[PDB]
Curated annotation (Swiss-Prot), chain A:
Keyword Ribonucleoprotein annotated: no
CDD domains linked to this entry: TCP1_eta
Highest taxon of source: Eukaryota
Protein name from the UniProt record: T-complex protein 1 subunit eta
Subunit structure: Heterooligomeric complex of about 850 to 900 kDa that forms two stacked rings, 12 to 16 nm in diameter.
UniProtKB/Swiss-Prot annotation, chain B:
Oligomeric form and interacting partners: Heterooligomeric complex of about 850 to 900 kDa that forms two stacked rings, 12 to 16 nm in diameter.
Family according to the record: Belongs to the TCP-1 chaperonin family.
Compartments it resides in: Cytoplasm
Organism: Saccharomyces cerevisiae (strain ATCC 204508 / S288c)
Gene responsible for this protein: CCT6
Protein's name in the database: T-complex protein 1 subunit zeta
Function: Molecular chaperone; assists the folding of proteins upon ATP hydrolysis. Known to play a role, in vitro, in the folding of actin and tubulin. In yeast may play a role in mitotic spindle formation.
Curated annotation (Swiss-Prot), chain C:
NCBIfam families linked: chap_CCT_theta (TIGR02346)
UniProt-listed GO biological process terms: chaperone mediated protein folding independent of cofactor; protein folding
PANTHER family: CHAPERONIN
Residues where Phosphoserine is found: S480
UniProt name for this protein: T-complex protein 1 subunit theta
Length: 507, 49, 524
């Protein structure tokens, strides 16, 4: 009956209400505690909805549509759910008046079909007009970094951000290919960019003051087995009554270990990486030959080394092939952050990079890293997609403006339905002003003044509260986000309003 | 066990054991052709359990 | 009134089916005991996952299986019609008419209804199996399940049906159009516009062998071998054991001469493709790639059954006996990239007509893509009703049949004397649920389209045959429009096998409920 539909309305608002403070770069962050006893705090709607695991079927649809938004595009997972659930509240008073839910869903598909046509009209392709090659990506990075603690140091941060994108092929770009390692302590303006890959350097074992950190072209070799004398678990049980045999079995167990240990020297690789801890036995023999070895390396960093110098992982030290080795241009071990950090530099075949960040605390750098991810997506999609639209309230207010005039020519229930859909588009600029501390009552009325003067580009300024054009604010958004957001929000809403009854079986 | 010297002998070892069954199979197919084999509206059905 | 309370329990299920039938209907969420969300329009899934105790609802569930197994369409027609017959019968139960004579009234009205169904046939299909002729049958089947894909999926489904259906007539001995003859696959990415129709089963495994595709020669011989590829051994057991390192050289060199000798005779016979149902050794890939033989592995035994109905190949339990009677024929074998992954497909061109085809579906959302697969799978069994048992005739759909039967049955009610006239008149009133169901789901006013619909079927013709309108249906539009459309415009009609079989099931479903005046149970 109608009771199940009303119950699904509050379920969509409850999920939407949690994502309202997370809308926008200045928006608040949500606290989610997983059953794994790990604290996770993020403003990205994808990770938010994936960690909740809501049992409600209609609320799960808002979670499933966010994964589809993260797949095709990946940006706007928070706004697509807010826009989808907003139609649940607008259609709530229409259900009590006797209006069928199918007539309401039918009016949305006619409004979205007309809205997509207006997106292409507002999208203007511009590349070399009034813009250069270097200044194109630099002006886009300063927009996402504004109104942040890094705004003073943003001058040095843009140079490292643009070079990170240009270091990869412009045909295929991925945010996971750019590594970021947090270094506690130090000045923020002293951070540098690294062409290779770095790791945490968890090696706790003695034997220091050897294996110098100045290399020319060291060879990289992957290690699998354990080269230390005493094993982790098993051992060798030998029962002998001779005194001389007690010393022989000590070297006998070491002879089997020295077998694969000596074969590493036959390869002639100065760099040895392994996912297992390397004891003091291997690093002592490698000290005289100036061979470096590091254990306890994460598996995620080992995959980047293969894509860097073109290496490979072999089980034993016998069949290792000579072409599996690799080398960088320069290897330097930096002590920045009261800890030594290994890094690679000058790899022409490297498909990944690493950007080091410095700050006063780990919690401060964590906000700098996440604020950079929003700027990378803008720089990445600039070269990929040449069709961009004006964001920050610009496009959102115009899509609702045109639907008001087109509804005057349409007769029937669909007139007020499109007007309700046009009113439902006002929640996006609302939460942006509320999460930024600005008054949502005054800006909503003042923005509609110049918005009716014929200019469609008037946006909302995120720095100082005022109405104006985002074209001077350098706020750019790709056209694929605005098109897929209206389709994903409507498709997810049509599935929720189409459920008359919820059946749940226990077992 | 079945021990074959050549690949063609493997099929001959299985056919040799079936030949004991095929020896009785030849008498069944010959019974239909011996009496009214080509006469129309006549047939034979194996009801063997 | 325990018989009345049994109808009230069905009334809760009756309202469930009112949101099912029709393109404007509603979809229900089915939560499985394994924690999986299931959303589909077809109501047979809901009745399958929900165990029924009370007999009145259980008979309707067993009656649903009667319609679902024999036909791929009309599952909602039986549940809605049989549920309304008990609702209109409450007026006769109240007046004091016994349920025994109520059944006798439906039995007399059933024979009068089935007789009029033969006169409702307007057109008839010539079984030409043309691309445009198959669109008329498939179009109403796609409707009431998925909206917006009706025009898109019309050309995709009709292409695969004509490939697996041979052209023949006046032969009823050999059955045609098996259920398994049509397979449907789906993949993430792309859209429905990029979907294509394959004339054979698509294999998702990658071409591990060095031979990507065969040559352009006609009728490539394919072999299906169940036995794995290895040195010839005993069929019973015959496990190779290792003892000393001296025997290792004889085991490696022994497999090189035996496999090369057996595969040399296979390539000389013209077999360019070998299907291995089991694991393939390392030495087997070395000899097959030098002779130009494409290596194909199918570990799933379910896919090998439908392959035997295409090229006519037979699986061989042994290895090394290339029997020509067990060899198949394929026109073209290539490797195409579907959804970003390169896979080796199976197809043919202008020869050896195949009884198995596969439609590749592409969609943005995996959740809605699975529902499209179920809508097409349900559309396959709807084609089965087009066979010899009265599959050529057709009746007007979109609510046109239920309205015309009202004037036909009510005319015989007052003409037939006796007490049976009370049940005959109420039997035609129960048909009013079909036009009202489409009106409530489409948002149309029940006080406008429904009463004005009877005025279209009632006209004064100076003759003995009512005519000049066969086309009056029920308006399925979601936008306000004056009047209703015609049947000829959208070519939306109901099949004879769907309508005639649903009447006999609906009458027997409501008869069992009216026949039960009490229940008898025991302690478990």
């Amino acid at each position: 009956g109608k009771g199940q539909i009303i119950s699904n309305i509050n379920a969509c608002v409850a999920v939407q209400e949690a994502l309202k403070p997370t809308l926008g770069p200045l928006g608040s962050d949500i606290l989610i505690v997983t059953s794994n006893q790990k604290t996770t705090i993020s403003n990205d709607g994808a990770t938010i909805l994936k960690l909740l695991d809501v049992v409600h079927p209609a609320a799960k649809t808002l979670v499933d549509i966010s994964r589809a938004q993260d797949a095709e595009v990946g940006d706007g997972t928070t706004s697509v759910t807010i826009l989808a659930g907003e139609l649940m509240k607008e259609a709530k008073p229409f259900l009590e008046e006797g209006i069928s839910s199918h007539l309401i869903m039918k009016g949305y598909r006619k409004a979205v079909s007309l809205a997509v046509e207006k997106i292409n009209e507002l999208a203007v392709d511009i590349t070399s007009e009034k813009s250069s090659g270097r200044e194109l990506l630099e002006r886009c990075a300063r927009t996402a970094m504004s109104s942040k603690l890094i705004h003073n140091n943003a001058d040095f941060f843009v140079k490292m951000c643009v070079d990170a994108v240009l270091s990869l092929d412009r045909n295929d770009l991925d945010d996971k290919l750019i590594g970021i390692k947090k270094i506690p302590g130090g000045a923020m303006e002293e951070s540098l960019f690294i062409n290779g890959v770095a790791f945490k350097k968890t090696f706790s074992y003695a034997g220091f003051e050897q294996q110098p950190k100045k290399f020319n072209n060291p060879k990289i070799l992957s290690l699998n087995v354990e080269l230390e004398l005493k094993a982790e678990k098993d051992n060798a049980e030998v029962r002998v009554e001779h005194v001389e045999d007690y010393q022989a079995i000590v070297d006998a167990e070491w002879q089997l270990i020295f077998e694969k240990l000596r074969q590493v020297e036959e390869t002639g690789a100065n760099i040895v990486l392994s996912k297992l801890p390397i004891g003091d036995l291997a690093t002592q023999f490698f000290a005289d030959r100036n061979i470096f070895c590091a254990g306890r390396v994460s598996a995620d960093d080992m995959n980047r080394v293969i894509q860097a110098v073109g290496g490979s992982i072999q089980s034993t030290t016998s069949d290792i092939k000579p072409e599996h080795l690799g080398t960088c241009a320069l290897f330097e071990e930096m002590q920045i952050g009261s800890e030594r950090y290994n890094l690679f530099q000058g790899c022409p075949q490297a498909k990944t990079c690493t950007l080091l960040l410095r700050g006063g605390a780990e919690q401060v750098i964590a906000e700098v890293e996440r604020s950079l991810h929003d700027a990378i997506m803008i720089v990445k999609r600039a070269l990929q997609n040449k069709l961009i639209v004006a964001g920050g309230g610009a496009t959102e207010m115009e899509v609702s403006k045109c639907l008001r005039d087109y509804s005057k020519t349409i007769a029937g229930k669909q007139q007020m339905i499109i007007n309700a859909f046009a009113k439902a588009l006002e929640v996006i600029p609302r939460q942006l002003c509320e999460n930024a501390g600005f008054d949502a009552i005054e800006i909503l009325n003042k923005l509609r003044l110049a918005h009716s003067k014929g200019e469609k580009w008037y946006g909302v300024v995120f720095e100082t509260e005022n109405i104006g054009d985002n074209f001077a604010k350098f706020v750019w958004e790709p056209a694929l986000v605005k098109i897929n957001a209206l389709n994903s929000a409507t498709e997810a809403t049509n599935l929720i309003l189409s459920v008359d009854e919820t059946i749940t079986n226990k077992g | 066990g079945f021990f074959y010297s050549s690949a063609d002998q493997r099929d001959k070892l299985a056919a040799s054991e079936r030949k004991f069954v095929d020896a009785k199979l030849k008498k069944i197919i010959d019974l239909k052709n011996e009496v009214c084999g080509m006469d129309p509206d006549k047939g034979f059905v194996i009801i063997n359990q | 009134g325990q018989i009345i309370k049994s109808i009230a329990a069905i009334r809760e299920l009756h309202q469930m089916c009112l949101t099912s039938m029709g393109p404007c209907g509603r979809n229900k969420i089915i939560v499985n005991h394994l924690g999986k969300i299931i959303i589909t329009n077809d109501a047979a899934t809901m009745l399958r996952e929900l165990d029924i105790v009370h007999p009145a609802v259980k008979v309707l569930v067993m009656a649903t299986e009667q319609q679902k197994i024999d036909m791929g369409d009309g599952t909602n027609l039986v549940m809605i019609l049989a549920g309304e017959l008990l609702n209109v019968s409450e007026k006769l139960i109240s007046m004091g008419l016994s349920a025994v004579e109520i059944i006798q009234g439906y039995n007399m009205a059933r024979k009068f209804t089935l007789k009029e169904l033969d006169e409702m046939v307007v057109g008839e299909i010539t079984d030409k199996n043309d691309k445009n002729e198959l669109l008329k049958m498939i179009k109403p089947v796609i409707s009431s399940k998925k909206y917006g894909s009706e025009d898109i999926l019309s050309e995709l489904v009709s292409e695969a049906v004509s490939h697996v259906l041979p052209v023949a007539q006046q032969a009823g001995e050999i059955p045609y159009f098996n259920v398994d003859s049509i397979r449907v696959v789906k993949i993430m990415g792309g859209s429905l516009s990029n979907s294509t129709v394959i004339k054979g089963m698509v294999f998702n495994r990658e071409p591990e062998g060095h031979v990507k595709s065969l040559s352009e020669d006609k009728k490539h011989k394919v072999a299906v071998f169940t036995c794995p590829l290895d040195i010839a051994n005993t069929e019973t057991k015959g496990t190779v054991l290792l003892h000393n390192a001296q025997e290792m050289l004889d085991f490696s060199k022994g497999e090189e001469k035996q496999i090369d000798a057996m595969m040399k005779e296979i390539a000389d016979m013209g077999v360019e493709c070998i299907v291995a149902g089991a694991g393939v050794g390392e030495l087997a890939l070395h000899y097959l790639n030098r002779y130009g033989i494409l290596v194909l592995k199918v570990p799933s035994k379910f896919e090998l059954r439908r392959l035997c109905r295409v090229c006519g190949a037979t699986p061989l339990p042994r290895l090394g006996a290339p029997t020509p009677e067990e060899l198949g024929l394929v026109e073209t074998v290539k490797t195409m990239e579907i959804g970003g992954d390169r896979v080796t497909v199976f197809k043919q061109e202008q020869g050896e007509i195949s009884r198995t085809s596969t439609i590749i579906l592409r969609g943005a959302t995996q959740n809605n893509l699975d529902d499209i697969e179920r809508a097409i799978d349900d559309g396959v069994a709807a084609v089965k009703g087009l066979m010899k048992p009265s599959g050529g005739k057709l009746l007007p759909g979109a609510g046109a049949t239920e309205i015309e039967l009202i004037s036909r049955i009510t005319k015989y009610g007052e003409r037939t004397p006796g007490l049976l006239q009370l049940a005959i008149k109420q039997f035609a009133v129960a048909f009013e649920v079909v036009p009202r169901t489409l009106a409530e789901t489409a948002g149309l006013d029940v006080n406008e389209v429904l009463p004005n619909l009877y005025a279209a079927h009632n006209v004064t013709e100076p003759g003995a045959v009512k005519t000049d309108h066969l086309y009056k249906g029920v308006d399925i539009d979601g936008e306000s429009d004056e009047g209703v459309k015609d049947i000829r415009e959208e070519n939306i009609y109901d099949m004879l096998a769907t309508k005639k079989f649903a009447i006999n099931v609906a009458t027997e479903a409501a008869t069992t409920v009216l026949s039960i005046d009490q229940i008898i149970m025991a302690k478990k």
